[PDB]
Assembly symmetry: C2
Homo-oligomer: 580 residues x 2
């Protein structure tokens, strides 16, 4: 409902709790009230000028009128520019507020809603929504309210000038122009759609005839395809002629009824002045005043398709404002009493769909200073289990606790502030390398950045790179090798400094110097730490405290490397798979 | 040079040899001469109206003036619409002529110039060139010549009205407005470029922060990345404020000097009317006339960047009009005396670059009704040799003849009208299947289409397909399997009906029913025909008249399948390769 629209937008014109911009909004509405006042009052002073020309038929008072002509007609576009100039800062604050609100609200967690959507449409609808808000409030307060107020105040000015049929015929003019502009823009839009479809068809046929140059040369369609492409060009250009001729008939019947309204009004004023029943000589006022009233009407009428496009851009954003979470912050959300790092699972379950069991009834209690290593099947059940330690997903039942307390009663940020997960990939934003390291924890100075780079050993890569300690990396910057990308990731987690460690070891192994180097840095970050590792490699699983393979939603075997080799479970099969 | 530009465009306004559209061009220039005549003459009649209002201070002659007011002011935009309405058909013919000219000229053969260019930019520069021609001639004859003619005829009308300093100060106004609009559009363009670069940077940082949702959630950058993204938004929005404020200062100093010019002109006319040294009461004429002169000047000034963009769109198209060929049609280009189909090579060479020898000194004479089968190395030398039988490329030396006469002295179309080459791929245009078959030879009726479909055997696929004999195929239509795509290709070549056959057999083999079916259709098209085959298969090479392997620019062995197996050349090595 438009009542909800107007209430929400009158709220959207309210910046904040600071007294320095509400005053500017008051300046904006003050000049908005001033503009129509001058826009109706200064042609009366033009009428005074020509009337005093007739009555002096004086130069000093005529100059005291001409100064009003100068400072009045040099003020219409000038006050419009001042309005739009402060409207700029209005748009600045409103766009900041709505963009940061929707950018916070698209950073909630609903991952099944996330992953099906690409990033481009998700942020394109956000940009369309903020430019929707901008264009919508600016046009509805700049070219809808003031032009209707101008028409109303023109008819009421005539009602205090002379109450006659003149206001009725001018009202007939403006209403007729409005109605015809709306209905022939509705005539325009189907021609625009058909012309777009035909130009897409002809350009597609053109480029797809150009794609196979060798068969176009193999056959003698050299003079045939130009004829068929000219046929498609004619078939599009006829509809092009129809659309442009529809524009012609729009402007033609528009200017025709404008000329008829000028003719009727000017003849009735001409009859009045030759019959002298009113003040005479005023014909220039009613002459230019119809044009001056009309000049914003096509400025409105070119935006009937635009306001409905703003509506469909803002309504989906309004739906996107307030939707949902997947993990719900329950009340009583408190801190995470990081005593020892002891994580227990008790007959737990999970679903990302209906009856969806990638995990079903596993249970353990991993101790401080000890290491679980996990192999799974050819599936994302391992990463899913890793994500539900993180509470990236939800549980249907069971009991997941960390250090005695359940993971679901608490704040998410105070849960994931004591957690360091190594990802198999590594994003590189288009930025520099000390900011890329401080992405681990942004409260660092550069001393801890350099200390963590010397802890990992990747500072020598920063020596090999140009910019000192600020090497610009990313998509357009300075690129990297994959093990070094994982070295930047482990340097980020080293700077973040948790106690709970969760490695996502890549199945893509590297050179044995790179392999033993990443295992040695994993040792240097994992020594006397509560460590949980998913892996598919050898050196990780031949030393850990317990090795688990979790396939088809269950633990399929339990025990150390010697236990699996002495009982000969599925580790024998995957032993043949790692061999070859 | 602009002299070449004006001469070429005055030629570009000349359609053809038909007397029905040059008359319409005469109508266009007649209304163009009429428009400025009425546009300067009707405010003089407004001046007559208000003057006769003062001198009657009559209604019948005043109505005989008011009818001129009606039919004159209801004619300015009306004659502009009629002009543009016939301008539409002018653009239709000129766009048809230039698009078909450039589409014929981009269908010449320079393949090294072809293949490095993608199709999209090649046709995008063509569309930009035709809209360049459209916008360039329409604006240079509609908003450059007429507004300069309007300013000139206004000053000369004043020179026949009263020769004074009034023309000089109004000329100062129009020239000053023109100069400031040009220089602040030059101020505008750098702000637009910087604003575009900043919005690209902020949206790239936004989407690349959104790309790795899981590491954004893994770290507590949930409240940090909104701050850094707000910092980038502020850094872009400041330049946005600067660009929009530059627009404000453009329109502000514009309307300021417009108000100053109105003030100076109106005061000098006010001094004149209060001193009565001219005809009096005429102040409305000089009042509205400055606005009416000015109204096309910003309509020009918004297109200074546009005309130079039209220039850079048309100049490259002018370079593209007339460039070159790779195979040159020598004079004496005659028919191809298709006696028997006997093709001879005599110490021939080829280069697509400097010192580029993929082929060097091969020589043979292939007979009628007999078959050469060709294997090469892992390279496109085979297809290159196939293309120089076609004369798709050029030769540096040697002697290539077909049926006694050299291939280079003749017309290309009469050479390639007796040639059927099977391509390894098959293009499917977005069209129907009988047109896809008639792509082989467009002079066919549907009887030969159905006869060729029953010759190949693919008419049963048309039975399996919905539309009878007009099944819509291509990129958006009804798709196909690869062997059936080659069946449509061989049906096209069957309809084309040459004598010279050149098969491009795929290395991708199929099922033995599909394999022996395509070999049987190749037999049904190749029986008692002059046949040349490139292949890598078995059934083609175990029966042909001679088998040649051509590697490193030379024939590496010669002989039949039994000859290569009894001498044991490289066919032994490739025998091990086809085995495994």
């Amino acid at each position: 409902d438009f009542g909800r629209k107007l209430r929400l937008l009158s709220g959207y014109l309210w910046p904040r709790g600071s007294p320095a911009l509400q005053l500017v909004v008051l300046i904006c509405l003050g000049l908005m009230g001033l503009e129509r006042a001058l826009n109706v009052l200064v042609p009366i002073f033009y009428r005074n000028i020509v009337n005093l020309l007739t009555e002096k038929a004086t130069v000093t008072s005529y100059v005291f009128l001409k100064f009003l002509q100068g400072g009045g007609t040099g003020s219409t576009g000038f006050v419009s520019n001042l309005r739009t100039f402060l409207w700029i800062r209005v748009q600045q604050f409103t766009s900041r507020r709505v963009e940061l609100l929707i950018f916070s609200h698209l950073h909630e967690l609903s991952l099944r809603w996330h992953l099906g959507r690409r990033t481009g449409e998700v942020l394109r609808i956000a940009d369309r929504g903020t430019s929707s808000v901008t264009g919508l409030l600016s046009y509805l307060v700049f070219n809808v309210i003031p032009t209707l107020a101008d028409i109303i105040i023109g008819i009421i000015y005539f009602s205090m000038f002379f109450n006659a049929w003149f206001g009725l015929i001018v009202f007939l003019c403006m209403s007729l122009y409005l109605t015809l502009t709306i209905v022939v823009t509705e005539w325009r839009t189907k021609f625009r759609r058909a012309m777009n479809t035909q130009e897409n068809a002809t350009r597609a046929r053109a480029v797809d005839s150009l794609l196979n140059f060798e068969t176009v040369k193999y056959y003698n369609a050299e003079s045939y395809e130009v004829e068929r492409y000219r046929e498609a060009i004619i078939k599009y250009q006829g509809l092009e002629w129809k659309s442009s001729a529809s524009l012609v008939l729009l402007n033609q019947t528009q200017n025709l009824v404008i000329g008829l309204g000028l003719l009727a009004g000017s003849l009735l004023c001409a009859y009045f002045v030759t019959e002298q029943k009113l003040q005479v000589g005023d014909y220039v006022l009613f002459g230019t005043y119809i044009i001056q009233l009309y000049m914003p009407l096509n400025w409105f009428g070119t935006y009937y398709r635009m306001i409905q496009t703003n509506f469909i851009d803002m309504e989906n954003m309004f739906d996107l404002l307030k939707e949902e979470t997947e993990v719900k912050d329950l009340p009583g959300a408190g801190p995470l009493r990081f005593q020892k790092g002891r994580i227990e699972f008790e007959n737990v379950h999970f679903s990302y769909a209906d009856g969806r069991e990638t995990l079903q009834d596993v249970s353990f209690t991993v101790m401080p200073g000890q290491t679980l290593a996990l192999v799974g099947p050819s599936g994302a059940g391992k990463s899913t289990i890793l994500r539900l330690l993180f509470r990236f997903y939800d549980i249907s039942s069971g009991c997941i606790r960390i250090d005695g307390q359940d993971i679901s009663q608490v704040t998410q940020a105070s849960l994931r502030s004591h957690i360091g997960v190594v990802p198999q990939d590594t994003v590189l934003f288009n930025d520099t390398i000390a900011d890329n390291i401080r992405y681990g924890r942004v409260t660092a100075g550069n001393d801890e950045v350099e200390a963590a780079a010397q802890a990992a050993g990747i500072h020598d890569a920063i020596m090999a790179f140009p910019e000192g300690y600020r090497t610009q990396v990313g998509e357009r910057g300075l690129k990297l090798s994959g093990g070094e990308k994982q070295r930047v990731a482990i340097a980020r987690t080293i700077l973040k400094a948790p106690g709970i460690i969760l490695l996502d070891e890549a199945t893509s192994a590297l050179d044995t110097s790179n392999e033993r180097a990443i295992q040695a840095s994993l040792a240097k970050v994992c020594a006397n730490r509560t460590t949980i590792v998913v892996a598919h490699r050898l050196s990780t699983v031949v030393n850990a405290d317990q090795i688990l393979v979790i396939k088809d939603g269950c633990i399929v075997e339990r025990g150390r490397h010697e236990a699996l080799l002495s009982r000969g479970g599925v580790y024998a099969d995957m032993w043949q798979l790692q061999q070859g």
